[PDB]
Amino acid sequence: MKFLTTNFLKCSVKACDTSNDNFPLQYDGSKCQLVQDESIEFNPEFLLNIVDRVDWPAVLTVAAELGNNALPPTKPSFPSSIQELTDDDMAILNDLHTLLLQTSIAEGEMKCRNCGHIYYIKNGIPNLLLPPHL
Amino acid sequence: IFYNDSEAHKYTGSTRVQHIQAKMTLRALELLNLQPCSFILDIGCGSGLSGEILTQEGDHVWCGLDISPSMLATGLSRELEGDLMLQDMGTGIPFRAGSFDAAISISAIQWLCNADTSYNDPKQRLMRFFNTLYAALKKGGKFVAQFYPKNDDQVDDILQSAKVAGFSGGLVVDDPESKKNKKYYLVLSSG
Ligand SMILES: C[S@@+](CC[C@H](N)C(=O)[O-])C[C@H]1O[C@@H](n2cnc3c(N)ncnc32)[C@H](O)[C@@H]1O
Ligand SMILES: [Zn+2]
Numbered sequence: 001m002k003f004l005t006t007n008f009l010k011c012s013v014k015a016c017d018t019s020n021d022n023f024p025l026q027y028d029g030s031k032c033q034l035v036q037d038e039s040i041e042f043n044p045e046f047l048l049n050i051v052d053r054v055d056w057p058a059v060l061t062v063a064a065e066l067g068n069n070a071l072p073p074t075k076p077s078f079p080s081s082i083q084e085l086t087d088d089d090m091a092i093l094n095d096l097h098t099l100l101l102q103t104s105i106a107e108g109e110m111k112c113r114n115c116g117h118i119y120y121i122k123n124g125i126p127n128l129l130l131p132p133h134l
Numbered sequence: 135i136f137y138n139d140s141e142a143h144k145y146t147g148s149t150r151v152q153h154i155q156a157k158m159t160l161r162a163l164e165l166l167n168l169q170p171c172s173f174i175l176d177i178g179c180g181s182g183l184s185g186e187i188l189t190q191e192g193d194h195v196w197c198g199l200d201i202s203p204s205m206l207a208t209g210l211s212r213e214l215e216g217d218l219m220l221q222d223m224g225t226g227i228p229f230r231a232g233s234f235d236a237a238i239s240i241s242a243i244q245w246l247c248n249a250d251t252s253y254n255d256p257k258q259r260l261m262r263f264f265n266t267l268y269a270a271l272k273k274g275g276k277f278v279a280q281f282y283p284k285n286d287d288q289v290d291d292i293l294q295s296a297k298v299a300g301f302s303g304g305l306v307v308d309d310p311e312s313k314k315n316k317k318y319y320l321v322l323s324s325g
Contacts, residue, residue, distance in 0.1 A: 045171040
């Protein structure tokens with residue numbers, strides 16, 4: 001499961017719908033096994049399209065939980081189009097690509113900060129099935 | 135439960151299945167009329183036949199939801215770029231508000247009329263599906279579903295549920311004079 005996905009995946013239990021703490025989930029840096037995957041080609045257009053939606057505080061939180069505190073405290077900003085990108089912009093987009101698209105959790109677990117429900121990741125795939133009463 | 139390792143493999147490995155799923159996915163994408171490099175939810179992604187096409191045709195990044203472990207396990211060997219998630223769409227779409235540019239679903243949502251897996255009404259699951267889908271889409275996000283209705287009451291129940299959830303749009307029916315080859319597409323947009 002890609003790091004990017006951690007920036008959008010919330011708790012599945014219905015009761016947690018209106019809770020500030022259904023997102024981000026709380027990733028267990030003890031259990032989570034990371035993989036880096038160069039197969040996904042650098043895609044600056046996608047990054048420009050997703051960056052406004054990205055929740056930077058939740059990026060920092062999950063990164064810290066996963067061992068990485070080397071990130072800037074504020075969300076990178078960019079011009080509105082590919083053709084206005086500078087060499088510096090491009091360097092920063094490359095790092096975002098690596099962080100968000102090329103890094104994934106292969107095995108691990110994460111929990112809802114609000115209800116405590118635990119989810120498991122196996123073979124890069126999160127199990128989001130819930131028991132009937134939730 | 136419906137699939138198993140044997141049947142998931144025979145489905146995903148059938149050339150006739152591959153060709154038809156590919157055609158309807160391409161048609162769904164045509165109806166979605168997206169900008170390239172968008173962020174997409176693929177609902178009922180199975181083994182990723184529809185998802186591969188999102189990757190190749192529009193350069194899209196996508197997440198796939200499916201309730202079947204053997205379908206997903208089959209997807210794992212196909213070199214997909216999407217994130218696969220074991221999930222029951224009738225329980226809701228578990229992403230924060232405004233996550234996705236669009237959602238797509240090929241041959242999957244008619245299962246929401248089925249009352250086997252869980253003990254909520256299909257009526258309730260249907261509503262849970264569309265209300266949470268509406269929320270997880272950006273404002274003006276689109277949803278196109280190719281689906282197989284059993285009868286016109288299923289169609290109008292699906293349309294009604296999508297309507298009450300906030301969606302607008304309609305039904306596209308390709309080759310409708312051939313009930314061997316006709317195909318229904320739900321084509322929606324959010325507010
Ligand atoms: C005929 S397959 C289509 C798969 C893929 N979209 C394609 O074009 O090949 C229908 C899929 O919907 C899935 N499905 C059925 N009910 C579901 C549910 N409640 N939530 C998520 N997926 C479901 C099945 O597991 C199956 O993979
Ligand atoms: Zn929760």
